[PDB]
Design a protein around this ligand. Structure first.
Ligand code: DGD
Ligand code: DGD
Ligand code: DGD
Ligand code: CLA
Ligand code: CLA
Ligand code: CLA
Ligand code: LMG
Ligand code: SQD
Ligand code: BCR
Ligand code: BCR
Ligand code: BCR
Ligand code: OEX
Ligand code: CL
Ligand code: FE2
Lengths: 448, 30, 35, 56, 33, 49, 37, 33, 61, 336, 50, 230
C-alpha cells in the first residue's frame, strides 16, 4: 500500500496512485479478470443447481444457461433439453481456472516488481510511448480476433449452433454455407436504426451471425498486425490525448455504446437470443395475443376478415400504412415482427386469409399459447403481471432483466466517459488542480 | 379572440429574454 | 419531396463535416494553459 | 396509387439513399470539406515527429 | 391570515435582531467553544 | 361546453377528466367506507376489454 | 440439477455467487485496518 | 429447520469469517498490509 | 466409485481454504516468501494434484 | 496574413471573444435547436389535430383550435407509425404528415441531439478558460432524464405515442397513464429522485440562508445588503467560521461541514446522483420492470385477504387502467 | 419552486467546485482549505464569464 | 405486376415498398371480348384498387350547382380491398353476374378537403351483386356503420356503453344501422386460358354521420379492378 502525503490521492481515489506503477497495475487487472471468470463459474453452477429440465428454461429465472444452450449443448428439436452435463462442465471449468488467474492477481499486486520497466523490457511501457501502445493494442486484437473464430469453427465443424429458423421448430444446425458477401454484411452497419430497419438487431438468420464473424475474425488479425508494425500518423498526433487516463476514457466511450446495443438486442432479436430459451420478446408476446385469439374465433366460426372493431378498423386483421395484411388493435405498432412460428403463415401480401384458416400446425398454436401467458411485463419483487395484477404467479422474463441491467451498466460508463475524458484533457493541459491565482486567463481578456 | 392574446404574452416573454441577454447591464470588475 | 431530401443531406453533411474536421484541427492545443 | 411518394421507410437502403444523386451529395460535400481542411493543414502545426501530442 | 403569519415572523425577527440588520460585525470569532 | 356538443373535439384535458372519473368512481368504495356505498359493475365507467 | 456424485455439495454452491460482493467490502475493511492513511 | 438450510448457513459463516481473518493475521504477525 | 470421489472432493475444499487464507499471509509478511517458498509449492501442487484426481474418475462415475 | 481560409475560420469558432461562445458542439447545436424551436412554436399554434392512437379520432393541440396555454400540446406521433422513421418527405402530401403526428418526431430528434451537444459545449468552454471540466457531468442528470421520457421509453413500448407530449396538460396525462401501467410511486428509483429534489431544495434553502445570515457589515441600512459585495473582489464577503459555529450548535458539531470545498461538493453530488436513479427508473420501467406489487399480500388464517394501503393504491390504478385509451383495447390485456 | 431550487443546488455546487483556486499540490483538492483564510476559494470572475 | 410476378417475391422482398397495396395488372388477354363462355366460374382473388376519391360537396359558393372536388388522402396506404371471393356466373348473350361474400371487403379511410376540414368513411363494396351485360354491372350494396355501437365520445357517451351529461341529439342518437350505396363495374380485358380478367369500376357510397350528428356526404370513386376465375 501507500499513503496520501506522497501522492496527493485519498483512500477513495486510491487506485489512481498506481497509474505510473506498471507492475502493480498489471496485478490489478489480472485480479479483476479473475473475478469475471469467478462470477462466470459460480453463477453457472448455481443456476444448474436450481434447474428443473422439464419446465422451460426462461421460466426458472435463468440468464447464463441460454447463452450456453444457444451454442447447442444438450439441446434437441424445438428447444428441449437432452442432458445437463455440459452446463455443469463450464461452471466447473471457469471456477477452477479463476484460481489460476486469482494467484496471478495476488502475486503481481503484492510481491512482483511494481515497475516492470527496466527489469522486463518487453513488458515495460510509458504512457506517452505511442509505438508501445499500438503494440499492446495490436496483440490483443489477435486474442480478440482468434476468439471470433472459435464461434465460426464451432458452427461449421463442431456440431453447429441452435438455428431457431429451422423448419418444424428450431434445432441444432451445422451452418455449412456462411453468407460472406460484403454488400450483404456491411448492409447492416449503414442501415438506419429506426423501426422496420433495426440497425444490427434485425439480422434474422444464423447464416449471417456466424457469417459476420468471419469478417471481424479476419479484420482484427489484419488490423492487429497493422498496429504492431506502425505508429500513429501525425494527424492522429494532432487529434488525441496521449496519457494514461485518456486511453481509459476512450474505452469507456466505447463500452458505453456496447451496453446500449446489448440492451436493445436482447429485447428485440429472437435469432441470436432464441425465444425458446430466453423467453419471447415484447413484440412477440403481443403478437401472440392476437394470433391465439384468432384461433378463438375459428372454433366459433365468425369471419375474421369481416370482424369489424368498435372504431371501424378491423377487430382481427387490418392494413399496414405501407399496405400489408397485419393484425389489429393496439398491437398494430408491432407489425414489423417476424418469427419462425408465424413466418410459415405469410405470403406476398402479408399473412394470407386462405392459409390462416386452413394451414395451422398444432405445434404453432401450442408455442403461441405459452407466449400469451409469459409476456415479459412484470414487477420488481417478481410478481409478474400488469401493475394491476395480484400476487399469484412468480415470473419475469430474462429479456427484461438483461435489457434493464445492461442499460444502466451501459449508461454510467458514458458518465464514466465524461468524467475521465474531461479530466485527462484537463490534466494534460495543466489546470486540473485549479486556477493559478497569479497568471490566470480571464483577467487577461477583453470584457463581454 | 383569446388565441391572439395568448400569443402576445408568449412572444412578450421572449422579448425580455432577448433584451436580458444582449442589452444587459454590463458587469464591471473592481 | 426528393428536392427536399437532397437539401437536408447537403445541410447535415455540411455541419457534420465541420464537426469532424473541426476537432482534427489541433483542438487540444486551443487552450489557455501554458507549458 | 392515389398518391405518389417515396416508399422507402422499411426498405433498409444504406444511409437512407435511394436515388444515386444522394450518394454524390453525401460524397461531394464530404470531399469539399476535406479539401479545405487538407489545404489549411499547413497552419495547424507540423507534428511530423517522434512524439508530439498533448502528452502527459 | 396564513400570510400574516409570515409577517409576524419577519417583523418579529427584525426587532430582536435589529442591531445586526445591516450585516454582522467584524469579529464574532469569540464563540469557538 | 365545446366537448359537450361535439364528439369530435378533444384534448389531453378532456382525456384527463375521464381519468379523474376513473379514480373517483373506482377507489371511493373502499376509500370512504363511512359512506356505506356499493356499486354495480355497470355503473362505473370503462373503455372496452 | 447437479450430478449424483456431486449432489451432497448443493449447500456450498448456493453461497458461491455472493462471494465477489464480499471483495468490495473487504477493501473497506483493509482501509480501516490502515486507518485511512 | 432443515439439514440443507443449516449447512448452507454454516457454509456462509466460514467464508465471511475467512475475509477479515486474512486482515487479522497480518495486522498481528506481519504488519505489512 | 462415488465415495472415493466425495472424500477426494472434501479434501479439495480443505486445501483451498488453506490456500485462500494462508497464501496472502505468506506474501504480505516481511521476508515470508523467501522463507516459505518451497512450503507454498507443496500446497499449490497438491491443489493441482487433486483437481486432476477428481477430474479423472468422473469418467468412472 | 499567411493564414488559410480554414484557419481564419477555426480562430473564430473557438474564439472566446464572442458574445455567445460557439465552439464545435455549437456549430451543430445551434442549427438543431433553432430548427426545433421554430417548429415547436408553429405546431403549438397552428397544428391541425393529430390522430394519436391510430383509431382516427384526431386530438386538438393548437391555440388556434380553441385551446389555452395549459391545454396546448404538440401531439405525439400516431400508433400506426410506431418506431418507423417518419420524416417530412416520406409523407405524400404535407397535410398527410401533419395528420399522422408529424412535428413530434421532428422536434424530439432535433431536441435530443441539441441537448447532447449543449452538454458538449459546456465542456468545451471550460477547456477554453482553464476551468476544471465537470460542469458537463452535472448537466447529464437532466439529459439522462429527458432522454428517457422521449426516446428510451418509446423504445421499450414500441411506439412514439406512449412518449411524453410537449404540453402542460399533455405532461399530466403522461404522468397518470404511466403510474396506472407501471406504479412508479412504488419503485425505489422514483423514491430516490423524490428525495433528490426534496433534499435538493432543503440543501439550497439551508445553505443560502446561512450565507445571507453571516454577511459582514459594510453598507448602511437604507442601502441594500447586496451593495457590500463589489465584483471581482478578493476578500471573503461572509464569516465562514460563524456559520459552522451556528450550525454546529444547531444539531451537533459533527453534523456540519467546516471545509467549504467539501460543502459545495455535497450540494452538487446530492441531487445529481438522485436524478440519475429516477432517470434510470423509467428507463428500466420502459422495459417493463414496473415496481413493487403488494396486492393481496397480507392474509390471515382461513384464507382471507386483508386490505392495506397498497390495495387502496390498487383501486386507483385499476380505475385508470380501464380508462386510458378508451377506444383502443380490443383484448383483455394491455400488452402494448 | 421545488425543481428550481434543485437546479440551484446543482449548479452552484458545481460552479464553485470547477472554478477553484490552485492552493495545494496534491490533487485531492479538499485538503487545500484553511477555513480561516481571508481570500475566497474560487473565482467569481471566471464563473461569471462561463 | 402480373400475378406470378407478385408470387415470385418473398415477404422480405415486398415489405415496405407498397407493392402489396396494388392489384395485379394483366398484360396477356383478349381486348375485344372473344370468349363469351357460359356457366359457373369461381370468382376468386377479386381485389379492387381505387384511384381518385372525389366528394359531392355542397359548395362553399352559394350557387346551387354541386360538383366533385379533388381530395388529399390522409391515411397512408390503407385503401385496397383484397381476397374477396365468390362465383362469377356467365351466360350466352352477355348476361353475367358476380356474388362475393368474404375477404377484406371494407377498409377505413379519412381524406381532406381544402378549407382545412376532414371527412372519413370506410371503403366497402360488401355483399354486392350486380347483373347485366359485360359493360354494366350496375347495382347496389350496403354501407355499414362507420364506428361501432360500443364507440365512446370524449365525454363517455354512446349507445352500447356510456353515461349522459337540448343536447339530446348528442347522446340519445347513437345509431348502428346500415345505409346503401351504388357501384358500377366494367370488364375491360379477358384472358381465355389462365382465368384472370381485369376492368375499370366506379363506385359511390355515403361517408359518415357522427352517429347521427351531421348529414353525411357522398363520394365518387374511380380506379381499376381484377378478378381470377379458377
Ligand atoms: C443497506 C442500505 C439500506 C437498505 C437498502 C435495500 C437494498 C439493499 C440491496 C438490495 C439487494 C437485496 C438482496 C436480497 C433481496 C433479494 O433481491 O432477493 C430476491 C432474490 C431471491 O429471492 C427469490 O427471488 C425469486 C425471483 O424470481 C425469479 O424466479 C422466478 C421463479 O421462481 C421467476 O423465474 C423470475 O423471473 C425470477 O426473477 C423469487 O421471487 C423467489 O420467490 C424469491 O425467494 O435474491 C436476489 O435475486 C438478489 C439479487 C441478485 C442480483 C442483483 C443484480 C440484478 C441486476 C438486474 C437488475 C438491474 C438493476 C435493477 C434495475 C431496476
Ligand atoms: C443515428 C440516430 C440514432 C438514434 C437512435 C434511435 C434508436 C431508436 C430505435 O428504434 O432503436 C431500436 C433499435 C432496434 O430497432 C428495432 O429493430 C427491430 C428488428 O426486429 C425484427 O428482426 C429481428 C431479427 O431477429 C426479430 O426477428 C424481430 O422480431 C423483428 O421484428 C424492429 O425492426 C423494430 O421495428 C426496430 O425498432 O435498437 C438499436 O438500434 C440499438 C442502437 C441504438 C440504441 C439507442 C438506445 C437509446 C440510447 C439513447 C441514449 C441514452 C441516453 C444517453 C444520454 C446521456
Ligand atoms: C451509399 C454510399 C455513400 C458513401 C458516402 C461517403 C462516406 C465517406 C466516409 C469517409 C469517412 C472518413 C473520415 C475520416 C478521414 C480522415 C482524413 C484525415 O485524417 O487526413 C489526414 C491526412 C493528412 O495527410 C497528410 O497531410 C500533410 C500536409 O502537409 C502540409 O502541412 C504540414 C503541416 O501541417 C507541412 O506544413 C507541409 O509542408 C504541408 O505540405 C502532407 O500532405 C502529407 O503528405 C499527407 O499525408 O490526410 C489523408 O491522408 C487522408 C487520406 C484519406 C483521404 C480520403 C479521401 C476520399 C475522397 C473520396 C472522393 C471525393 C471526391 C471529392 C471531389 C471534390 C470536388 C467535388
Ligand atoms: C478488485 C478491485 C481492486 C484491486 C485489484 C485493487 C488492487 C490494488 N489496490 Mg486498490 N482499491 C479498491 C479496489 C481494488 N484495488 C477499492 C474498491 C478501493 C477503495 C476502498 C481501493 C483503494 C486503494 C488504496 C487507497 C490503495 C489501493 C492499493 C492497491 C494495490 C496494492 C494493495 C496492497 O498493498 O495490498 C496490501 C493489502 C493486503 C495485504 C490485504 C489483503 C489483500 C489480499 C490480496 C486479499 C486476498 C483476497 C483473496 C482471498 C486471495 C485469494 C487467494 C488466491 C491466491 C487464490 C493493488 C494493486 C494501494 C496502492 O496505491 O498501491 C500502490 C493503495 O494505497 N487500493
Ligand atoms: C473501466 C472502469 C473504470 C476504471 C478502470 C476507472 C478507474 C479510475 N477511476 Mg473512474 N469511473 C468509472 C469507471 C472506471 N474508472 C465510472 C463508471 C464512473 C462513473 C460513476 C467513474 C467515476 C469516477 C470518479 C468520479 C472518480 C474516478 C476515479 C478513478 C480512479 C480511481 C478509482 C478509485 O480509487 O475508486 C475506488 C473505489 C471506490 C471508492 C468504490 C466506490 C464505489 C461505490 C461503492 C459505488 C458502487 C455502488 C454499486 C456497486 C453500484 C451497482 C451498479 C448499479 C448501478 C447497476 C481510477 C483511475 C477517481 C479519480 O481520481 O479520477 C481519476 C474519481 O474521483 N472514477
Ligand atoms: C478496437 C480496436 C482498434 C483500436 C482501438 C484502434 C485504434 C486506432 N487505429 Mg486502428 N484498426 C483496427 C482496430 C482498432 N484501431 C482494425 C480492426 C483495423 C483494420 C481495418 C484498423 C486499421 C487502422 C488503420 C489503417 C489506421 C488505424 C489507425 C488508428 C488510430 C486512429 C484511429 C482514428 O483516428 O479513428 C477515428 C475514426 C475515424 C477517423 C473514422 C473511422 C470510421 C470508419 C471509416 C468506419 C466506416 C466504415 C463504414 C461502415 C464502411 C462503409 C461501407 C459502405 C460503402 C457500404 C488509433 C490508434 C490509424 C493510425 O493511427 O495509424 C496507425 C490508421 O491509419 N487503424
Ligand atoms: C449514446 C450512444 C447510443 C448508441 C449509439 C450508437 C447507435 C446509434 C447510431 C446507429 C447507427 C448509425 C449509423 C448510420 C445509420 C444511418 O445512416 O441511418 C440514416 C438515418 C435515417 O436515414 C433514413 O433511412 C430511411 C430508410 O431508408 C429512409 O430512407 C429515410 O429517408 C432516411 O432519412 O439518418 C439519421 O438518422 C440522421 C443521421 C445524422 C447523424 C447526426 C449525428 C452526427 C454527430 C457528429 C458525429 C461525429 C462522428
Ligand atoms: C423576438 C422579439 C419579439 C418582439 C420583442 C418585443 C419586446 C417587448 C419588451 C421589451 C422590453 C424592454 C425592457 C427595457 C429595455 C431596456 O431597458 O434597454 C436599455 C437599453 C440600454 O442599452 C445601453 O445602450 C447604451 C448605448 S446608447 O447610449 O444607447 O447609444 C450603452 O451605453 C449601454 O451599455 C447599454 O446598456 O436601451 C437601448 O439602448 C435601446 C432602447 C431600448 C428601449 C426600447 C424597448 C422597447 C421597444 C422594443 C421593440 C418594440 C416593441 C413594442 C412594444 C414596446
Ligand atoms: C489486489 C488486492 C485486492 C484484490 C484481490 C483479489 C480480487 C483477489 C482475487 C482472488 C481470486 C479471484 C480468487 C479465486 C479463487 C478461486 C478458487 C480458490 C476456486 C476454488 C474452486 C473450488 C474449490 C471448486 C470446488 C468444487 C468443484 C471442484 C466443483 C463443484 C463442487 C465444488 C464447489 C466443491 C483487494 C481488492 C482486496 C484490495 C487489496 C489488494
Ligand atoms: C459479426 C456481426 C456482424 C458484423 C459486424 C461488423 C462487421 C461490425 C463492424 C463494425 C465497425 C467497422 C464499426 C466501426 C465503427 C467506427 C466508429 C465507431 C468510429 C468512431 C469515430 C470516432 C470515435 C472519431 C472521433 C473523433 C472525431 C469525431 C473527430 C476528431 C477526434 C476523434 C478522432 C476522436 C453482422 C452485423 C454482419 C451480424 C451480427 C454480428
Ligand atoms: C471459491 C471457494 C472458496 C473461496 C472463497 C473465497 C475466495 C472467499 C473470499 C471471501 C472474502 C474475502 C470475504 C470478505 C468478507 C468481508 C466482509 C464481509 C466485510 C464486511 C465489512 C463490513 C460490512 C463493514 C464495513 C465498514 C467498515 C469496516 C469501515 C467503513 C464503514 C463500514 C461499516 C461499511 C473456498 C476456499 C472457501 C472453498 C469453497 C469455494
Ligand atoms: O399507447 Mn399510451 O398506454 Ca402502452 O398500454 Mn396499451 O398502448 Mn397505450 O394502452 Mn396502455
Ligand atoms: Cl389491442
Ligand atoms: Fe455557496
Amino acid at each position: 500500500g501507500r499513503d496520501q502525503e506522497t501522492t496527493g490521492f485519498a483512500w477513495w481515489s486510491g487506485n489512481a496512485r498506481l497509474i505510473n506503477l506498471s507492475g502493480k497495475l498489471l496485478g490489478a487487472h489480472v485480479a479483476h479478470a479473475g473475478l469475471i471468470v469467478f462470477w462466470a463459474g459460480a453463477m453457472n453452477l448455481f443456476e444448474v443447481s436450481h434447474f428443473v429440465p422439464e419446465k422451460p428454461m426462461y421460466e426458472q429465472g435463468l440468464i447464463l444457461l441460454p447463452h450456453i444452450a444457444t451454442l447447442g449443448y444438450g439441446v434437441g428439436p424445438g428447444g428441449e433439453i437432452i442432458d445437463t452435463f455440459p452446463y455443469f462442465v463450464s461452471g466447473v471449468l471457469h471456477l477452477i481456472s479463476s484460481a489460476v488467474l486469482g494467484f496471478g492477481g495476488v502475486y503481481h499486486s503484492l510481491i512482483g516488481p511494481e515497475t516492470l520497466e527496466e527489469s522486463y523490457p518487453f513488458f515495460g511501457y510509458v504512457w506517452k510511448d505511442k509505438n508501445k501502445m499500438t503494440n499492446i493494442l495490436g496483440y490483443h486484437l489477435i486474442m480478440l480476433g482468434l476468439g471470433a473464430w472459435l464461434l465460426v469453427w464451432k458452427a461449421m465443424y463442431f456440431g453447429g449452433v441452435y438455428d431457431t429458423w429451422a423448419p418444424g421448430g428450431g434445432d441444432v444446425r451445422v451452418i455449412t454455407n456462411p453468407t460472406t458477401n460484403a454488400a450483404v454484411i456491411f448492409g447492416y452497419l449503414v442501415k438506419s436504426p429506426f423501426g422496420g430497419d433495426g440497425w444490427i438487431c434485425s439480422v434474422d438468420n444464423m447464416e449471417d451471425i456466424i457469417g459476420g464473424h468471419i469478417w471481424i475474425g479476419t479484420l482484427e488479425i489484419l488490423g492487429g498486425i497493422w498496429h504492431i508494425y506502425t505508429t500513429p500518423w501525425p494527424w492522429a498526433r494532432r487529434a488525441f490525448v496521449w496519457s494514461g487516463e485518456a486511453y481509459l476514457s476512450y474505452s469507456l466511450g466505447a463500452i458505453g455504446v456496447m451496453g446500449f446495443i446489448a440492451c436493445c438486442m436482447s429485447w428485440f432479436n429472437n435469432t441470436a437470443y432464441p425465444s425458446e430459451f430466453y423467453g419471447p420478446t415484447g413484440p412477440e408476446a403481443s403478437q401472440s395475443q392476437a394470433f391465439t385469439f384468432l384461433v378463438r374465433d375459428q372454433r366459433l366460426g365468425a369471419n375474421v376478415a369481416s370482424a369489424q372493431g368498435p372504431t371501424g378498423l378491423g377487430k382481427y386483421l387490418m392494413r399496414s400504412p405501407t399496405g400489408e395484411i397485419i393484425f389489429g388493435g393496439e398491437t398494430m405498432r408491432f407489425w414489423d415482427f417476424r418469427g419462425p412460428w408465424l413466418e410459415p403463415l405469410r405470403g406476398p401480401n402479408g399473412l394470407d386469409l386462405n392459409k390462416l384458416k386452413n394451414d395451422i400446425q398444432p405445434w404453432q398454436e401450442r408455442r403461441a399459447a405459452e407466449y400469451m401467458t409469459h409476456a415479459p411485463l412484470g414487477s420488481l419483487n417478481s410478481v409478474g403481471g400488469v401493475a394491476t395484477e395480484i400476487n399469484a404467479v412468480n415470473f419475469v422474463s430474462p429479456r427484461s432483466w438483461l435489457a434493464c441491467s445492461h442499460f444502466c451498466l451501459g449508461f454510467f460508463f458514458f458518465i464514466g466517459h465524461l468524467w475521465h475524458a474531461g479530466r485527462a484533457r484537463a490534466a494534460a493541459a495543466g489546470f486540473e488542480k485549479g486556477i493559478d491565482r497569479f497568471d490566470e486567463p480571464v483577467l487577461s481578456m477583453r470584457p463581454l | 379572440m383569446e388565441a391572439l392574446v395568448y400569443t402576445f404574452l408568449l412572444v412578450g416573454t421572449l422579448g425580455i429574454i432577448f433584451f436580458s441577454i444582449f442589452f444587459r447591464d454590463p458587469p464591471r470588475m473592481i | 419531396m426528393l428536392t427536399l431530401k437532397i437539401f437536408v443531406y447537403t445541410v447535415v453533411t455540411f455541419f457534420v463535416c465541420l464537426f469532424i474536421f473541426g476537432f482534427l484541427s489541433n483542438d487540444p492545443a486551443r487552450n489557455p494553459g501554458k507549458n | 396509387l392515389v398518391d405518389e411518394r417515396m416508399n422507402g421507410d422499411g426498405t433498409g437502403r444504406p444511409f437512407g439513399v435511394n436515388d444515386p444523386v444522394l450518394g454524390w451529395v453525401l460524397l461531394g460535400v464530404f470531399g469539399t470539406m476535406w479539401a479545405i481542411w487538407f489545404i489549411g493543414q499547413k497552419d495547424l502545426g507540423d507534428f511530423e515527429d517522434a512524439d508530439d501530442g498533448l502528452k502527459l | 391570515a396564513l400570510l400574516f403569519f409570515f409577517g409576524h415572523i419577519w417583523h418579529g425577527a427584525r426587532t430582536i435582531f435589529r442591531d445586526v440588520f445591516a450585516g454582522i460585525d467584524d469579529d464574532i470569532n469569540d464563540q469557538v467553544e | 361546453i365545446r366537448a359537450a356538443e361535439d364528439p369530435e373535439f378533444e384534448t389531453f384535458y378532456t382525456k384527463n377528466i375521464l381519468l379523474n372519473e376513473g379514480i373517483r368512481a373506482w377507489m371511493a368504495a373502499q376509500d370512504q367506507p363511512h359512506e356505506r356505498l356499493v356499486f354495480p359493475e355497470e355503473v362505473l365507467p370503462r373503455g372496452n376489454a | 440439477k447437479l450430478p449424483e456424485a456431486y449432489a451432497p455439495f448443493a449447500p456450498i454452491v448456493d453461497v458461491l455467487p455472493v462471494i465477489p460482493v464480499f471483495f468490495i467490502l473487504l477493501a473497506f475493511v483493509w482501509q480501516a485496518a490502515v486507518s485511512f492513511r | 429447520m432443515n439439514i440443507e438450510l443449516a449447512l448452507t448457513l454454516v457454509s456462509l459463516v466460514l467464508v465471511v469469517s475467512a475475509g477479515p481473518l486474512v486482515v487479522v493475521l497480518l495486522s498481528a504477525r506481519g504488519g505489512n498490509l | 466409485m462415488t465415495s472415493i470421489l466425495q472424500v477426494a472432493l472434501l479434501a479439495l475444499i480443505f486445501v483451498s481454504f488453506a490456500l485462500v487464507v494462508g497464501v496472502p499471509v505468506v506474501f504480505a509478511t516481511p521476508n515470508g516468501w523467501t522463507d516459505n517458498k518451497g512450503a507454498v509449492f507443496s500446497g499449490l501442487s497438491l491443489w493441482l494434484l487433486l483437481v486432476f484426481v477428481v477430474g479423472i474418475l468422473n469418467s468412472f462415475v | 496574413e499567411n493564414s488559410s481560409l480554414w484557419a481564419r475560420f477555426c480562430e473564430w469558432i473557438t474564439s472566446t471573444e464572442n458574445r455567445l461562445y460557439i465552439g464545435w458542439f455549437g456549430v451543430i447545436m445551434i442549427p438543431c435547436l433553432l430548427t426545433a424551436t421554430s417548429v415547436f412554436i408553429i405546431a403549438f399554434i397552428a397544428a391541425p389535430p393529430v390522430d394519436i392512437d391510430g383509431i382516427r379520432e384526431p386530438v386538438s393541440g393548437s391555440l388556434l383550435y380553441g385551446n389555452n396555454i395549459i391545454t396546448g400540446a404538440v401531439i405525439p406521433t400516431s400508433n400506426a407509425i410506431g418506431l418507423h422513421f417518419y420524416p417530412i418527405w416520406e409523407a405524400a402530401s404535407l397535410d398527410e404528415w401533419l395528420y399522422n403526428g408529424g412535428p413530434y418526431q421532428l422536434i424530439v430528434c432535433h431536441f435530443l441531439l441539441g441537448v447532447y451537444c449543449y452538454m458538449g459545449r459546456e465542456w468545451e468552454l471550460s477547456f477554453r478558460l482553464g476551468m476544471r471540466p465537470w460542469i458537463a457531468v452535472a448537466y447529464s442528470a437532466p439529459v439522462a432524464a429527458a432522454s428517457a421520457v422521449f426516446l428510451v421509453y418509446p423504445i421499450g413500448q414500441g411506439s412514439f405515442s406512449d412518449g411524453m407530449p410537449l404540453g402542460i396538460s399533455g405532461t399530466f396525462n403522461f404522468m397518470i397513464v404511466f403510474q396506472a401501467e407501471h406504479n412508479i410511486l412504488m419503485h425505489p428509483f422514483h423514491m430516490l429522485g423524490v428525495a433528490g429534489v426534496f433534499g435538493g431544495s432543503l440543501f439550497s434553502a439551508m445553505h443560502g440562508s446561512l450565507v445571507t445570515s453571516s454577511l459582514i457589515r459594510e453598507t448602511t441600512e437604507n442601502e441594500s445588503a447586496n451593495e457590500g459585495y463589489r465584483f471581482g473582489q478578493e476578500e471573503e464577503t461572509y464569516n465562514i467560521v460563524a456559520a459552522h459555529g451556528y450550525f454546529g450548535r444547531l444539531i451537533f458539531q459533527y453534523a456540519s461541514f467546516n471545509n467549504s470545498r467539501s460543502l459545495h461538493f455535497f450540494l452538487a453530488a446530492w441531487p445529481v446522483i438522485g436524478i440519475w436513479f429516477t432517470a434510470l427508473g423509467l428507463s428500466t420501467m420502459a422495459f417493463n420492470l414496473n415496481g413493487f406489487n403488494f396486492n393481496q399480500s397480507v392474509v390471515d388464517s382461513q384464507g382471507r385477504v386483508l386490505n392495506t394501503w397498497a390495495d387502496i393504491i390498487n383501486r386507483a390504478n385499476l380505475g385508470m387502467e380501464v380508462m386510458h385509451e378508451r377506444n383502443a383495447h380490443n383484448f383483455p390485456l394491455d400488452l402494448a | 419552486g421545488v425543481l428550481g431550487a434543485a437546479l440551484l443546488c446543482a449548479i452552484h455546487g458545481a460552479t464553485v467546485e470547477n472554478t477553484l483556486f490552485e492552493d495545494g499540490d496534491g490533487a485531492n483538492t479538499f485538503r487545500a482549505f484553511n477555513p480561516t483564510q481571508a481570500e475566497e476559494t474560487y473565482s467569481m470572475v471566471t464563473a461569471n464569464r462561463f | 405486376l402480373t400475378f406470378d410476378e407478385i408470387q415470385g417475391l418473398t415477404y422480405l422482398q415486398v415489405k415496405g415498398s407498397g407493392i402489396a397495396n396494388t392489384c395485379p395488372v394483366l398484360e396477356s388477354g383478349t381486348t375485344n371480348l372473344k370468349e363469351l363462355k357460359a356457366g359457373s366460374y369461381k370468382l376468386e382473388n377479386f381485389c379492387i384498387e381505387p384511384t381518385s376519391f372525389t366528394v359531392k360537396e355542397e359548395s362553399q359558393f352559394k350557387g346551387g350547382e354541386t360538383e366533385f372536388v379533388k381530395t388529399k388522402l390522409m391515411t397512408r396506404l390503407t385503401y385496397t380491398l383484397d381476397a374477396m371471393s365468390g362465383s362469377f356466373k356467365v351466360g350466352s348473350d352477355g348476361s353475367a353476374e358476380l356474388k362475393e361474400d368474404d375477404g377484406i371487403d371494407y377498409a377505413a379511410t379519412t381524406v381532406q378537403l381544402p378549407g382545412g376540414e376532414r371527412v372519413a368513411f370506410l371503403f366497402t363494396i360488401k355483399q354486392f351483386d350486380g347483373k347485366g351485360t359485360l359493360d354494366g354491372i350496375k347495382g347496389d350494396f350496403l354501407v355499414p356503420s362507420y364506428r361501432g355501437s360500443s364507440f365512446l365520445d370524449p365525454k363517455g357517451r354512446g349507445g352500447s356503453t356510456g353515461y349522459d351529461n337540448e343536447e339530446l341529439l348528442k347522446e340519445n342518437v347513437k345509431i348502428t344501422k346500415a345505409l346503401k350505396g351504388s357501384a358500377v363495374f366494367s370488364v375491360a380485358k379477358v384472358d381465355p386460358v389462365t382465368g384472370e380478367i381485369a376492368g375499370v369500376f366506379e363506385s359511390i357510397q355515403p361517408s359518415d354521420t357522427d352517429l347521427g350528428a351531421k348529414p353525411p356526404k357522398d363520394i365518387k370513386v374511380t380506379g381499376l379492378w381484377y378478378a381470377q376465375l379458377k
